Amino acid sequence: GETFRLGVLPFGTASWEAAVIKARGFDTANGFTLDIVKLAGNDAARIAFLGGQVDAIVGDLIFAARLGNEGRGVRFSPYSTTEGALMVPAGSPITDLKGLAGKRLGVAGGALDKNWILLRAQARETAGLELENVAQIAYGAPPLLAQKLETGELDAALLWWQFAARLEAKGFKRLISADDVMRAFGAKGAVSLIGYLYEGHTVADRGEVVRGFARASAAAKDALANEPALWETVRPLMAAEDDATFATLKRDFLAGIPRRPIAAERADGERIYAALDRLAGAQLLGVGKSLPPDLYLD
Ligand SMILES: O=C(O)c1cc(C(=O)O)c2c(n1)C(=O)C(=O)c1cc(C(=O)O)[nH]c1-2
Ligand SMILES: [Cl-]
Ligand SMILES: [Cl-]
Ligand SMILES: [Cl-]
Ligand SMILES: [Cl-]
Ligand SMILES: [Cl-]
């Protein structure tokens, strides 16, 4: 038949809907077999994608835009409008971004993470501060940063949303989300910065497998949003034995399910990007002043 190789991170949320697609036969329903390919980290996943070893990964719009500017045929489709979360210890004196001054601040995903670009942009706009000038920044993969915030080696951390949910039950609070920054900018609606990235070659030569997968994913998200029993099936993949954690993960995932037309999604992306290029020109030097053309999957 047709196999679609999807690269997933072991601490990512993409595995959850991939497991629904397989369990419910939504790949079969669309004439293909989904092969879930476990990749160690985001840097490993990005290389496998550059190396043509998968048909898709989950990644951010900026990286997709950068790969487009750098010459790739990558196509983006919205995966979630839920992204980022600045976590501080409960009762933290930090009530504003200025409070980060003189603190050890973890940043998940490195110096070019989409959440970091947004946070830096928000801080320059609302206070003319360069967080990298005042805060002791520590870059690293999300699991490490979550662990070090728990152990007190860090005073705050910008983490992927799933980790923030688990930290609340360890006595941690969300100072701000990446969704917060973007509503502060004045975005028209919920905006997906996390997407499926489809390989240019697969789009060109196996376009129906791509559409079949995109349909399978939307059906899985739809099922998760309409069948509360289905969640207890995927719980083993969620690392959520704790009950308040499980409920918080479910609530944030549901809130993130993209429900806006690609046209509206693409237009908010273009505007939010051009706003960020004015506040974070250096970090996006690999991407350009504007989003590549035809980046969004039709
Ligand atoms: O900022 C975030 O909250 C967030 C969440 C997730 C996620 O849903 O696991 C990903 C990312 N970011 C991300 O940038 C990324 O490349 C990614 C890959 C995967 C995955 O499951 O394979 N999740 C995510
Ligand atoms: Cl095949
Ligand atoms: Cl790997
Ligand atoms: Cl590509
Ligand atoms: Cl379908
Ligand atoms: Cl910059």
In this structure, are 252 and 201 located in the same domain? yes
In this structure, are 114 and 240 located in the same domain? no
Asked if residue 114 is part of any domain, the answer here is: yes
Ligand 1: residues whose CB is within 6 Å?
A: 8-9, 12-14, 42, 58-60, 80, 83-84, 115, 160-162, 194
In this structure, are 145 and 132 located in the same domain? yes
| Matching residue, tokens 């997709």 | 64
Atom of ligand 1 nearest to the CA of 7: 22
In this structure, are 221 and 99 located in the same domain? no
Domains in the chain: how many in total?
A: 2
Integer Cα distance of 250 and 165 in angstroms: 10
Integer Cα distance of 136 and 100 in angstroms: 9
Beta strands 194-198 and 75-80: pairing type?
A: antiparallel
Backbone φ and ψ for 107, nearest 5 degrees, come out as -130, 110
In this structure, are 67 and 196 located in the same domain? yes
Integer Cα distance of 58 and 192 in angstroms: 12
Asked if residue 256 is part of any domain, the answer here is: yes
Integer Cα distance of 169 and 246 in angstroms: 10
What's the 72 CA to ligand 4 centre distance in angstroms? Answer: 5
CATH of the domain at 8: 3.40.190.10
Q: Which of 176, 201, 227 is the last residue of a domain?
A: 176
Q: What one-character-per-residue DSSP string does 132-185 give? A: HHHSEEEEE-HHHHHHHHHTTS-SEEEE-HHHHHHHHTTTEEEEE-HHHHHHHH
In this structure, are 113 and 254 located in the same domain? no
* Structural tokens at position 192: 């997906």
293 with 72: CB under 8 angstroms? no
Integer Cα distance of 225 and 264 in angstroms: 22
In this structure, are 11 and 66 located in the same domain? yes
Integer Cα distance of 275 and 118 in angstroms: 10
Of 13, 62, 76, 238, best ligand 1 pocket probe by most atoms within 8 Å of the beta carbon:
13
Tell how far CA 240 is from the center of its chain. 19
Q: What one-character-per-residue DSSP string does the chain give? A: --EEEEEE-TTSSHHHHHHHHHHTTTTGGGT-EEEEEE-SSHHHHHHHHHTT-SSEEEEEHHHHHHHHHTT---EEEEEES---EEEEETT-S--SGGGGTTSEEEEET-TT-HHHHHHHHHHHHHH---HHHHSEEEEE-HHHHHHHHHTTS-SEEEE-HHHHHHHHTTTEEEEE-HHHHHHHHT-SS----EEEEE-HHHHHH-HHHHHHHHHHHHHHHHHHHH-HHHHHHHGGGGT--SHHHHHHHHHHHHHHS--S-HHHHHHHHHHHHHHHHHH-TTTTTTT-SSPPTT-B--
Question: Going by C-beta distance under 8 Å and a sequence separation of 6 or more, which residues neighbour residue 14?
Answer: 6, 8, 58, 79
Asked if residue 99 is part of any domain, the answer here is: yes
Deposited experimental method: X-ray
In this structure, are 17 and 163 located in the same domain? no
What's the 1 CA to ligand 5 centre distance in angstroms? Answer: 17
Question: Going by C-beta distance under 8 Å and a sequence separation of 6 or more, which residues neighbour residue 150?
Answer: 167, 170, 172
* Structural tokens at position 215: 């349909």
Asked if residue 183 is part of any domain, the answer here is: no
In this structure, are 11 and 33 located in the same domain? yes
* Structural tokens at position 227: 């069948």
Short-list 108, 101, 93, 97, CA closest to 157: 108
Burial class (CB in 10 A: 0-12, 13-18, 19+), 281: exposed
In this structure, are 256 and 243 located in the same domain? yes
End-to-end CA distance of the chain: 24
In this structure, are 68 and 9 located in the same domain? yes
Q: Which of 176, 205, 230 is the last residue of a domain?
A: 176
296 with 265: CB under 8 angstroms? yes
For residue 232, give its domain range. 3-81+191-279
Integer Cα distance of 252 and 244 in angstroms: 12
Q: Which residue is closest in CA terms to ligand 1's atom 24?
A: 12
In this structure, are 134 and 157 located in the same domain? yes
Asked if residue 285 is part of any domain, the answer here is: no
What's the 251 CA to ligand 4 centre distance in angstroms? Answer: 33
Q: Which residue is closest in CA terms to ligand 1's atom 5?
A: 160
What's the 278 CA to ligand 4 centre distance in angstroms? Answer: 27
Q: Which residue is closest in CA terms to ligand 1's atom 12?
A: 160
What's the 83 CA to ligand 4 centre distance in angstroms? Answer: 23
Burial class (CB in 10 A: 0-12, 13-18, 19+), 263: exposed
Asked if residue 218 is part of any domain, the answer here is: yes
As a whole number of Å, the CA-based R_g of the chain is 19
